[PDB]
Curated annotation (Swiss-Prot):
Keywords: Acetylation, Cadmium, Metal-binding, Metal-thiolate cluster. It comes from the Eukaryota. GO terms for molecular function: metal ion binding. Disulfide bonds: none annotated. Signal peptide: none annotated. 14 cysteine residues are arranged in C-X-C groups. These are thought to be the metal-binding sites in other metallothioneins. This is Cadmium-metallothionein. The modification N-acetylserine is found at residue 2.
Length: 67
């Protein structure tokens, strides 16, 4: 049942639709919302070292090397 929803570190912007984090993002790790989450690590392997391969499994809540 888990996997649907937002995290505690989500913004009031991410909790709006559409995602208002386009100009106001501060979401933490508990956010798999690709609307505000972006990543540079590729599917062949993690590049930053947080063990992530894209926003689909990016633990990083921005402000990281792969950001
Ligand atoms: Cd969020
Ligand atoms: Cd979002
Ligand atoms: Cd956000
Ligand atoms: Cd990474
Ligand atoms: Cd990442
Ligand atoms: Cd990272």
């Amino acid at each position: 049942g888990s996997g649907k929803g937002k995290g505690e570190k989500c913004t009031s912007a991410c909790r709006s639709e559409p995602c208002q984090c386009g100009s106001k993002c501060q979401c933490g790790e508990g956010c798999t919302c690709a609307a505000c989450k972006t990543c540079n690590c590729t599917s062949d392997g993690c590049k930053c070292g947080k063990e992530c391969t894209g926003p689909d499994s990016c633990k990083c809540g921005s402000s990281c090397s792969c950001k």
